[PDB]
Design a protein around this ligand. Structure first.
Ligand SMILES: Nc1ncnc2c1ncn2[C@@H]1O[C@H](COP(=O)(O)OP(=O)(O)OP(O)(O)=S)[C@@H](O)[C@H]1O
Ligand SMILES: Nc1ncnc2c1ncn2[C@@H]1O[C@H](COP(=O)(O)OP(=O)(O)OP(O)(O)=S)[C@@H](O)[C@H]1O
Ligand SMILES: Nc1nc2c(ncn2[C@@H]2O[C@H](COP(=O)(O)OP(=O)(O)O)[C@@H](O)[C@H]2O)c(=O)[nH]1
Ligand SMILES: [Mg+2]
Ligand SMILES: [Mg+2]
Lengths: 316, 327, 335, 354, 120
């Protein structure tokens, strides 16, 4: 199980920023994250259905249902040696986010100091201790700094049970958020974070209405007075005991609304600030999807993707 | 606007002439206002006798239609702690009238709900500003009023409404509505009112509802009992006769049948039987002792729920055992 | 079909409109004609458990306003909410003073939309006396735009002034005579096959509570479906599910009481409490057996009626079942 | 290792070995758990009510219901009296004991449970389209010990949010349960195991542990000493086996709870002597018992029946004893300090005997 | 806390006052004595493998509340000791989750058939 990877921040800084944002998001979302090393790309998962995450009973206690999925093309790493006898040479593992975050923070500090070394990542069998292995990470500091992180490999049966949520694309309204680097980026960033000024607000009602040809509103009804925050700037639209959730009848064919938690909205705001191309998709009374895309070309290259699925916090 | 109101509020007296039953109090207060020598007042009485209506009507008469500008009304729905007495009541009582319209009036409705500290603070406010202000205190429970406050107020007792006043008000309401009330229905309504006008008006409104065509349908005693779900006097008499003469099985069957015929509740049957027995001429007094104690215990037990059948059997057995003394 | 089968039968078959409420016509008629009169008074619903008070008020509110307007015209508070004196003086008062919301054209077209709101105080008997006193003039003053509905099981817990203010509606107990049609309809809807008289037995066991009867019917239906024999439900199964003591056990208890031996009674009661029978049911069955028996005299029946009443009252206070049952049996054996 | 009470605890409905009819009823309940009503299990303590509830949950959800963890939830009173409650959780259900909060139990119902009832549990569907909904299961231990206010607060929470929550309450007696709560529940009677079934379970445990047993009669005696409390039976079996070098014999003493022996000694003292000083020493014993947090009503039961077990007493004495026991049990229920009522009972018994 | 964090058993306070508070410490004391005797015999020299699993400093071998002597800042220190032992129990339990989980039954032999390789 060779997983030899080389990471350099001086070449293609966009990929390094994407990886840093992915690790930060998974660390801030849940305690443990799944890493899937395929022969083509690396997929980082933050889901409550993982073996380690499900040990917290988050879904039943605090409704932690959101799922974060991040894709990193193999071109990001200078060297990508991933050989396996599984489907598409896939290797699945579970890791703790805090240690990886600390290691990457140390690497960022070293890079900011002035070093231009490379990080080598490999899988090793630690004799100290689903067998548990270690992620040997090493790098030079203008001194050969080496750190190891515990990791738990997963089987094919365990791997296949982690499936990315999908949405009814036909019954789904998408809006292309203005680029953060654009002149309206600051305005939209302030608009997203406006609701944070109300500490006691827990749920926010996102609404999208046709007729730049659509508009987005954030409604707060938890205060003693009704509150609506509207965006008037440009915004373009992209053209067992289990039972199905009940969906309220749409007011009109061109209006899509959903109620979500404020923490998910803060995560979405951070993601929007991180990346340039952001799409907000709403499934009426069902869910909200934040899709951040990073485009790179040479024969266009693979598109970096971060998809955050948020289930409704309340029914409409 | 008034048409949509509940009858208990739609028929609230506007002038003192519309208040019935309290002839002595109305007479005295009217003469006091005529001479303009109103003292500090206490209106003590049971619910729905006309205290709030009387005080509001007196304020209207004193200040005409603009009484809301120089009358300070406070009730249990408002906070009336010692701070309120020290600041708001004090400032109102210590300031001039709007247009030098004599003295100001402070109404403390439901004052039995005020704390002891606030009542104590009220003493000197009442005493010092008597020249410019007069206080009115309304209550149903005198034991909640401090002795000092009681000493400072001229006391007027609102009695339970007599039958004649209730009949007059019922006639007024019947004329105002397009309603027809039978004498037996009126007697039943007066009996169930227990001197409270609010109950009379509420039951009358429900009875009007019960009628299919109120324009021509007349309210009978049966309509009253249906609306109130109360037992008829014949039911009570039959139950008592069966208890006092029939055997245990027959008495149990009679009670069950009478209750099941119209879904009567046991507490009302007990109350009616107690009313009937209060007039009974008993040669042995121990019988009265047993009856009263056992029936009071049964009423208290019923107040907390329990088993209905066991309670009914207990009533039967208690009456039988008590009347074995008369033997 | 799965979504419709996600609810217990009591919630599934909760009345939707006032027409679905059964056996309470004496008040339902008044409430219904209030829709045309628009003269709704303050109401005090009182009655024993599971008689249809909450359902009636919910149906009335739905009929008066509609799904949309209701949200702006209804304020509901129950025992699960804090209802201290400060709450009554601030939140309830503010709602009572709120201006009547403007109905939409659709609402006016489809519903009467009376020009007042409704404050529902469910389980009002749990409120304190001072908090209740804080409601008096609030209800009186704002009756032009607000109407109150108090609901309770123990009317004596409502202070006299509030009872005087409110028009009273007593909800009668639901027995085999007045509630059988609804239970038969529910059984027919769920295709429950029961022997003749089974619904009568359920309603007699429930003792005025239709909610308990519906739950019992659901439990019997589940048992029959699991068995999957296609046979009709029997009264014996219903009695077993309800916790009724079998007649033979009661006969044994009666024989022991007749014998009069203290030690034998103590031993039998110690063994009988093993099965976990509820003392209330045993006391009720003993009352039924003794009061209706023709083999005992009048003095015996008077004494046993008082003993049974005392034991039942003690049990209502959450007393200890073994001690109370043994004391009752020893007292009876001494009669 | 773990105590034998928990070591051999059944983990599924098919593993239940006593009260077959109850198992059949529970399996019938688990057939279509989609419309499961609220449940109230009542029966003698230590019979297996919690075990049956967990088996039912396992039938509905799966073995994961036994993967339990503990969390601490903080509550603040109107007087700013901060305090904490233990909440047990499995990925499919919650377990709480609000009675540990004393008079503050109502707060737990008003803040925690309601919130749990209000938060609707939804999850992304692995294969199908759209979110899937699942009701939460909450177990209320020691339901009979809740104050009337908390029980009242339970009512509309149970009714309104029936889609999101299903309550399973467990009690040893239904006398303290208010009528509305019983009306809102499916009542399940859990009989105690018979002596034969207790002996069979103990024999299976003995065989598993490889403990030499001289005769099966010992097990029977153990059963007869437990008064149908299977947990107590297993605890005494373990204690006796450990105290006898894993070799039980007909002469091996039966180990009983220490407070039970103390109450027996107190009963003997009461029978032997009836005077004021005897009453003061009885007070001392009662206070010692209360210092160990033994409930007052339990003390009254045990003392009453220990007294009724005395052979020298006559019929009149026992009748008076049970009368006083009933009266003072009611007084304890309606009282504030239990010492008054226990002393009154003992004094009345002393008067009736002397 | 000890029971929950060492045996995955949850028990009510009432049962502790009635039954466990006396029986459990007695059982643990007997097991500790047997373990000490076995260790002494081995030093001077599987069937009872469940006896020597008792830890001297984490297990409770004393009657809760002391003996019932009837007829034959202490609180702060006790709370501090309880907190210390709870911290030790949490430390012991934390590594169990990462060490391994029951999960489900899979092809562990196949997993061992492709061992990790590390070499430069
Ligand atoms: N003497 C009365 N004459 C005519 N109507 C009365 C009379 N007393 C009470 N009512 C009627 O009942 C309603 C209530 O009268 P109130 O004056 O508020 O009684 P109350 O004595 O103030 O009740 P409490 O003590 O605050 S519970 C009035 O609107 C009237 O319609
Ligand atoms: N009159 C009724 N008609 C039809 N169903 C009823 C009736 N009364 C009770 N039920 C049934 O039992 C369930 C509960 O009815 P409720 O209205 O909640 O009774 P309740 O009087 O409010 O009980 P309490 O006082 O809160 S214990 C309903 O959903 C119905 O399924
Ligand atoms: N072998 C076997 N053990 C049981 C059974 N039922 C209960 N037990 C055990 O006996 C004890 C019963 O105590 P518990 O579950 O707390 O019952 P509760 O106090 O009434 O809820 C537990 O230790 C169970 O493991 C059964 O049916 N078969
Ligand atoms: Mg008044
Ligand atoms: Mg209700």
């Amino acid at each position: 199980m060779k997983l030899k990877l080389i990471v350099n921040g001086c070449e293609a800084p966009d990929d390094y920023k994407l990886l840093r944002t992915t690790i930060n998001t998974v660390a801030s979302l849940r305690k443990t994250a799944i890493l899937r090393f395929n022969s083509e790309r690396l997929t980082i998962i933050s889901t409550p259905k993982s073996s380690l995450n499900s040990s917290n009973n988050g879904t039943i206690l605090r409704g932690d249902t959101g799922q974060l999925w991040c894709t990193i093309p193999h071109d990001v790493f200078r060297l990508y040696t991933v050989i396996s006898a599984r489907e598409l040479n896939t290797i699945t593992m579970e890791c703790n986010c805090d240690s990886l975050l600390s290691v990457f923070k140390r690497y960022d500090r070293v890079m900011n100091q002035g070093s231009s070394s490379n990080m080598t990542i490999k899988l090793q069998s630690m004799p100290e201790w689903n067998p548990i292995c270690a992620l040997g990470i090493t790098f030079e500091e203008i001194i050969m700094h080496s750190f190891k992180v515990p990791v738990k490999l997963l089987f094919r049966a365990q791997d296949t049970r982690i499936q990315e949520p999908m949405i009814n694309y036909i019954q789904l309204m998408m809006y292309k958020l203005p680029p953060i680097s654009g002149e309206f980026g600051s305005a939209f960033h302030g608009f997203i974070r406006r609701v944070e000024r109300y500490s006691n607000v827990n749920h926010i009602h996102l609404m999208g209405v046709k007729k730049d040809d659509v508009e987005l509103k954030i409604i707060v009804n938890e205060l003693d007075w009704h509150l609506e925050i509207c965006w008037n700037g440009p915004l373009d639209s992209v053209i067992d005991i289990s039972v199905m959730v009940e969906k309220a009848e749409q007011e009109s064919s061109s209006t899509h609304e959903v109620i979500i938690r404020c923490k998910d909205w803060k995560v979405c705001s951070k993601l929007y600030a991180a990346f340039e191309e952001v799409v907000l998709a709403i499934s009426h009374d069902e869910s909200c999807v934040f899709h951040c895309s990073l485009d790179r070309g040479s024969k266009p290259r693979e598109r970096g993707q971060i998809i955050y699925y948020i289930a409704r916090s309340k029914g409409l | 606007s008034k048409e949509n109101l509940p009858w208990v509020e739609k028929y609230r007296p506007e002038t003192l002439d519309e208040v019935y039953g309290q002839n002595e109090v109305i007479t005295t207060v009217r003469k006091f206002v005529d001479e303009g020598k109103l003292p500090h007042l206490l209106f003590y009485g049971p619910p729905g006798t006309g205290k709030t209506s009387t005080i509001v009507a007196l304020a209207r008469e004193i200040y005409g239609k603009n009484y809301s500008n120089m009358v300070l009304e406070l009730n249990a729905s408002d906070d009336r702690g010692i701070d309120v007495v020290r600041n708001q009541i004090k400032d109102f009582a210590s300031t001039r009238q709007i247009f030098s319209k004599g003295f100001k009036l402070i109404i403390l409705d439901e004052a039995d709900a005020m704390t002891n500290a606030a009542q104590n603070a009220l003493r000197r406010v009442i005493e010092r500003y008597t020249k410019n202000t007069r206080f009115c205190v309304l209550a149903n429970y005198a034991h909640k009023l401090t002795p000092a406050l009681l000493s400072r107020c001229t006391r007027f007792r609102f009695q339970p409404l007599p039958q004649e006043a209730i009949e007059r008000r019922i006639a007024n309401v019947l004329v105002h509505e397009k309603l027809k009330l039978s004498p037996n229905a009126e007697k039943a309504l007066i009996e169930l009112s227990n001197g409270d006008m609010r109950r009379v008006l509420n039951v009358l409104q429900s009875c009007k509802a019960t009628l299919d065509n109120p324009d021509e349908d007349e309210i009978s005693d049966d309509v009253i009992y249906e609306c109130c779900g109360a037992p008829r006097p014949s039911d009570l008499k039959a139950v008592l006769k069966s208890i006092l003469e029939d055997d245990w099985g027959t008495a149990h069957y009679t009670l069950n049948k009478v209750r099941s015929a119209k879904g009567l509740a046991l507490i009302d049957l007990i109350e009616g039987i107690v009313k009937i027995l209060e007039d009974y001429e008993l040669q042995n007094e121990e019988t009265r002792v047993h009856l009263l104690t056992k029936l009071a215990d049964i009423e208290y037990s019923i107040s907390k729920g329990g088993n209905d059948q066991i309670q009914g059997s207990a009533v039967i057995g208690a009456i039988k055992a008590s009347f074995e003394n008369e033997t | 079909e799965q979504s419709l089968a996600q609810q217990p039968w009591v919630e599934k078959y909760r009345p939707k409109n006032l027409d679905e409420v059964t056996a309470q016509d004496h008040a339902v008629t008044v409430l219904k004609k209030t829709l045309k009169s628009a003269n709704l008074p303050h109401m005090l619903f009182y009655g024993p458990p599971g008689t249809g008070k909450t359902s009636t008020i919910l149906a009335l509110t739905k009929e008066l306003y509609g799904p949309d307007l209701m949200k702006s015209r209804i304020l509901e508070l129950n025992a699960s909410d804090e209802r201290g004196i400060s709450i009554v003086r601030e939140k309830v008062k503010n709602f009572a003073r709120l201006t009547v919301s403007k109905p939409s054209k659709h609402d006016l077209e489809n519903y009467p939309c009376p020009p007042y709101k409704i404050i529902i105080l469910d389980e009002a008997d749990s409120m304190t006396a001072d908090a209740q006193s804080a409601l008096r003039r609030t209800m009186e003053t704002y009756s032009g735009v607000t109407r109150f509905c108090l609901i309770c099981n123990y009317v004596t817990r409502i202070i006299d002034p509030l009872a005087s203010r409110c028009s009273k509606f007593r909800f009668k107990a639901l027995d085999a005579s007045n509630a059988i049609d609804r239970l038969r309809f529910i059984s027919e809807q769920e295709n429950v096959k029961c022997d003749d008289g089974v619904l009568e037995r359920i309603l007699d066991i429930s003792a005025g509570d239709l909610r308990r009867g519906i739950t019992l019917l659901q439990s019997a239906s589940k048992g029959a479906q699991y068995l999957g024999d296609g046979k009709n439900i029997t009264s014996t199964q219903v009695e077993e599910l309800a916790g009724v003591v079998p007649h033979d056990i009661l006969i044994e208890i009666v024989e022991k009481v007749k014998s009069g031996d203290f030690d034998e009674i103590k031993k039998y009661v110690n063994t009988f409490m093993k099965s976990g029978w509820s003392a209330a049911s045993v006391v009720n069955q003993l009352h039924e057996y003794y009061i209706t028996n023709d083999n005992f005299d009048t003095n015996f029946k008077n004494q046993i009626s008082w003993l049974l009443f005392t034991t039942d009252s003690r049990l209502n206070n959450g007393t200890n079942e073994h001690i109370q049952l043994l004391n009752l049996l020893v007292k009876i054996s001494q009669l | 290792m773990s105590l034998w009470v928990d070591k051999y605890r059944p983990k599924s409905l098919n593993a239940l070995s006593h009260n077959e009819e109850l198992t059949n009823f529970l399996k019938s309940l688990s057939d279509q758990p989609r419309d499961l009503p609220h449940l109230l299990l009542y029966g003698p303590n230590g019979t297996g009510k919690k075990t049956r509830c967990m088996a039912l949950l396992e039938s509905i959800f799966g073995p994961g219901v036994y993967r339990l963890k503990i969390d601490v939830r903080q509550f603040v009173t109107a007087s700013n009296r901060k305090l904490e409650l233990n909440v047990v959780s499995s990925p499919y259900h919650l377990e709480i004991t609000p009675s540990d909060m004393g008079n503050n139990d109502r707060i737990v119902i008003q803040e925690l449970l309601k919130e749990v009832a209000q938060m609707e549990q939804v999850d992304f569907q692995d294969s199908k389209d759209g979110l899937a909904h699942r009701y939460k299961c909450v177990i209320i231990n020691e339901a009979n010990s809740l104050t009337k206010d908390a029980q009242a607060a339970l009512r509309r929470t149970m009714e309104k949010y029936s889609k999101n929550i299903r309550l399973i309450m467990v009690c040893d007696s239904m006398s303290p349960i208010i009528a509305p709560i019983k009306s809102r529940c499916l009542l399940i009677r859990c009989p105690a195991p018979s002596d034969s079934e207790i002996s069979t379970i103990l024999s299976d445990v003995v065989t598993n542990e490889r403990i030499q047993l001289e005769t099966k009669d010992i097990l029977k005696r153990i059963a007869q000493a437990s008064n149908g409390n299977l947990r107590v039976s297993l605890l005494m079996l373990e204690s006796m086996a450990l105290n006898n070098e894993l070799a039980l014999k007909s002469s091996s003493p039966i180990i009983k709870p220490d407070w039970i022996i103390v109450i027996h000694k107190l009963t003997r003292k009461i029978v032997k002597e009836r005077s004021v000083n005897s009453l003061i020493e009885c007070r001392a014993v009662l206070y010692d018992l209360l210092a160990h947090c033994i409930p007052a009503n339990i003390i009254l039961k045990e003392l009453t029946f220990s007294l009724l077990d005395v052979e020298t007493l006559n019929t009149t004495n026992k009748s008076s004893i049970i009368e006083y026991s009933s009266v003072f049990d009611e007084r304890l229920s309606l009282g504030n300090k239990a010492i008054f009522h226990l002393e009154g009972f003992i004094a009345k018994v002393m008067c009736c005997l002397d | 806390n000890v029971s929950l964090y060492k045996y995955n058993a949850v028990h009510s306070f009432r049962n502790i006052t009635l039954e466990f508070g006396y029986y459990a410490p007695l059982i643990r004391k007997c097991q500790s004595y047997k373990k000490k005797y076995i260790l002494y015999y081995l030093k001077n020299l599987d069937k009872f493998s469940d006896i020597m699993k008792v830890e001297n400093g984490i297990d409770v071998v004393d009657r809760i509340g002391g003996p019932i002597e009837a007829l034959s800042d202490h609180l702060e220190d006790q709370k501090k000791e309880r907190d210390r032992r709870l911290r030790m129990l949490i430390d012991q339990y934390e590594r169990n989750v990462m060490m391994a989980n029951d999960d489900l039954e899979d092809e562990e032999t196949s997993f061992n058939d492709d061992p990790i390789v590390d070499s430069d």
